[PDB]
Every structure is written in C-alpha cells, then in structure tokens.
Design a protein around this ligand. Structure first.
Ligand SMILES: [Cl-]
Length: 420
C-alpha cells in the first residue's frame, strides 16, 4: 500500500487528472482521427474508432480549459474537417444511409468490421456539437458540426415506439440488422439526436415516430424498466437483468437531456449505489475485494474485450474475468460520496494492477482482474476510458458537472427554461 507520505491524496488526483487527458493526447493521430485502443507499449494498429472522435473532441475542451491544450480549437477543426470528408487523403466510410462504420483504418480510411453503428455515429455527433458550443466563436466549427448532425438521420433507427425499440445497426446496403435494443440503455444517445432531428431536418425519415418515442421513453423516467439491486431501483432494459453502467455515464456526460434532468441524475446516483452494493456482495472462492474496490465497466480483459455487468446478489456471471473498472469508479465521482476516496485507495493498492504509466510519465488507472490477479492490461479502449477523464474533470473544484451540463446543451439557449 502506497503511504500518504510517499504520495498525498491531492498528488494522486492531480496525476490521474492530467494522465487522463494525456491518454487522449496519445490516442489522437495528427490527421485528426483517433485510434480505438491505446497500446501501453507505444504500438499503433492504425485501427480507429468513430466514437473516439466524439469522445476526443470532448476531451480537447477539457484539456483546453485546464491549460494543457492551447491548440485545441485547431485540433478540433482538423478532426471535424476529417469527419466531414474534407481531407482529400481519405474520408471515413459511411453506408447507404450515411451511417458511419464503427472502425476504420486511420492511414487509408478502409472500413474495418461490419458495424454501421448509429450509436457510435451519435457519439461522434455529440462531440462535434460539444466543441461547437465550447469554441462558440468559431463559425467553421459550427458549420462542420451542423453538417455532421444533419447528414446522418437517426430518426430512421427508431424501430418501434410502443415497445421502446431501436435498431442496433445497419448492413452496408442500409438495411437494418435483425437486432433491436430496448430502453433504458446508451441508445438514449440515438434517441436524443433523432428527437432533435425530427424538429430540425426538413426531410427526417421518421420524424413523428422519433418524437413519440422520445416523449414516452426518455423525456422522463416514468415508463423505463426498473431492475432492483438489493431493493435499489436501477433503470434497465427489463426487470430481471441490469444494463451496462457506462450507459448511465455516457448519457450523463454527453446529453443535456440526461445531465439536466433530475430524474436521470437520481437514476445515475442509484445505479452507482447498486454497483457498490454488488461489489460488496460478491463472494467468489479465493477472492477478497477490499471495500474500496468497485465499478462495472467495459474494456480490455483477460478474455479480450469484456462488457461487465452486475447481477443480483453478487452474481458475477456477467463479469467473466471478475474485472473491476476504475474508469467507471472515476465516472461516479460527481455522483457518489465515496467514489473519489475509493479511487485514491485503488491507486494506493499495490496488490492490484490498476496503475498504468503512459509515455511521458503520465499516470492513469485501468481495469484489473480478480480471477487473474497477475494479468495487466496491454491496451485501453478509448470509448470506455472516456469516463475516467470526465469524472475527474467533473469534480466540483475542477471543471464541475456544470462544465458538461453547459457545453452538452446543444439544442437550447441559456434562458430557455427561465422567465423571459
Ligand atoms: Cl469504440
């Protein structure tokens, strides 16, 4: 255990906060694309993620605000021009409905995989709109953001209003894959854009249904499914399982419709209480978690890539390597009283492989396994890692959650809900 004499709580938080931004600085390519994964050894696969352009745009504002990225406005422009197809070296692939491919080659632009992804498209668009707000005097950033927002219609992904279903993905030719996904989850991101587009796009495919969908499932929490963890109500896709915790965090940091809505904020707080309670209920032979260890996330694991979820009464069947996620714990810091202290404790614990150093000596925390304590991650997926910086940045004495609730307000002016 690292003593408070060797390193103070403040020194730890300062290191991790700067480290969380250096991550993004390293994930970013000069051409304004972002790798899917950061390799801790300095390797680069040149496999990019569209989602990480959105998260990286957000991160640029955080670095800027902290004095760590004085070029940020121009880095944001480079990324947005690249996303808009305005760099002649290559464009990111889009399918027959202008949906972006999830992954692509960051040297050549070749598509990678089969996932023409509305959600990853939506994360990119949010990041564009976030930098538009942040660099609000740059007209070219506004124009590019508006172009990206208007040119992928997400109203088409609303599948069935009465059951809360959105199509997961499209095929190359623009038809939908079979799979539908139900509220509550991170497809709130999709719904939100579709709700705005219904108002804003002249030719929205499916405007009325997108509005109706939003009004039932996401204008309030009233109709969302609830699954109870030890009597704690947790929004979910149904009553007998839990969705991913990152869904609450992505929706909160990226969408005003979540972060500015007290029902949704309360839901995120409850969800974090359930994740803590879960980790305290785990009783696996040969494992002993300390009290400060918790957070159910997605990301690299001994099995490759894992989407870890909690389940009733400490049941770890949906957490295949019994991985604990410090990016999720960090993400909770503004929303749970003990998360910050627990993140620090986690850093101090030398029996777990949570600490990682980046090139340049920067420090972060990341996923580690209780089934395989000697495992140490070799890379970090940006979409998941996002919430580490965001949670640290949203500390009250850092930028605060009001930073995100201000700059994620894409669709309203400041006095919208005030007296005229
Ligand atoms: Cl991704």
């Amino acid at each position: 255990v690292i003593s408070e004499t060797v390193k103070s709580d403040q020194e730890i938080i300062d290191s991790l906060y700067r480290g969380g931004y250096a991550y993004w600085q390293q994930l970013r390519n000069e051409n304004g694309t972002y790798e899917d994964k950061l390799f801790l050894n300095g390797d680069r696969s040149y496999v990019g993620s569209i989602a990480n352009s959105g998260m990286g745009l957000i991160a640029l504002t955080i670095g800027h605000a902290n004095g760590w990225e004085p070029e940020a406005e121009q880095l944001a422009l480079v990324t947005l021009r690249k996303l808009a197809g305005r760099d002649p070296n290559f464009a990111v692939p889009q399918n027959a409905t202008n949906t972006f491919i999830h992954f692509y080659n960051t040297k050549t632009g070749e598509a990678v995989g089969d996932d023409w992804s509305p959600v990853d498209s939506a994360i990119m668009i949010y990041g564009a709109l976030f930098v538009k707000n942040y660099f609000s005097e740059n007209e070219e950033i506004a124009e590019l953001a508006d172009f990206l927002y208007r040119n992928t219609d997400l109203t088409q992904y609303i599948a069935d209003v009465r059951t809360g279903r959105i199509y997961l993905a499209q095929h190359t030719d623009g038809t939908f894959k079979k799979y539908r996904t139900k509220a509550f989850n991170e497809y709130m991101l999709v719904a939100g854009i579709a709700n705005q587009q219904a108002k804003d796009l002249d030719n929205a495919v499916n405007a009325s249904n997108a509005k109706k969908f939003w009004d039932i499932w996401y204008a309030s929490t009233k109709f969302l499914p609830v699954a109870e963890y030890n009597g704690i109500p947790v929004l979910s896709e149904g009553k007998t399982w839990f969705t991913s915790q990152f869904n609450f965090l992505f929706n909160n940091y990226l969408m005003h419709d979540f972060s500015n809505h007290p029902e949704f904020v309360t839901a995120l707080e409850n969800s974090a209480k359930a994740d803590f309670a879960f980790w305290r209920d785990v009783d696996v032979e040969g494992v002993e978690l300390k009290e400060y260890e918790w957070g159910s996330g997605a990301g690299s694991c001994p099995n490759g890539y894992c989407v870890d979820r909690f389940h009733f009464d400490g049941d770890r069947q949906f957490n295949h390597n019994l991985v604990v996620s410090p990016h999720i714990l960090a993400g909770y810091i503004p929303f749970n009283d003990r998360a910050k202290a627990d993140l620090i404790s986690t850093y101090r614990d030398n029996t777990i492989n949570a600490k990682h150093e980046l090139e340049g000596g920067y420090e972060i925390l990341w996923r580690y396994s209780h089934d395989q304590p000697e495992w140490k991650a070799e890379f970090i997926e940006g979409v998941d890692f996002s919430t580490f910086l965001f949670g640290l940045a949203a500390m009250p004495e850092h930028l605060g959650m009001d930073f995100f609730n201000k700059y994620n307000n894409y669709f309203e002016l400041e006095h919208h809900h005030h007296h005229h």
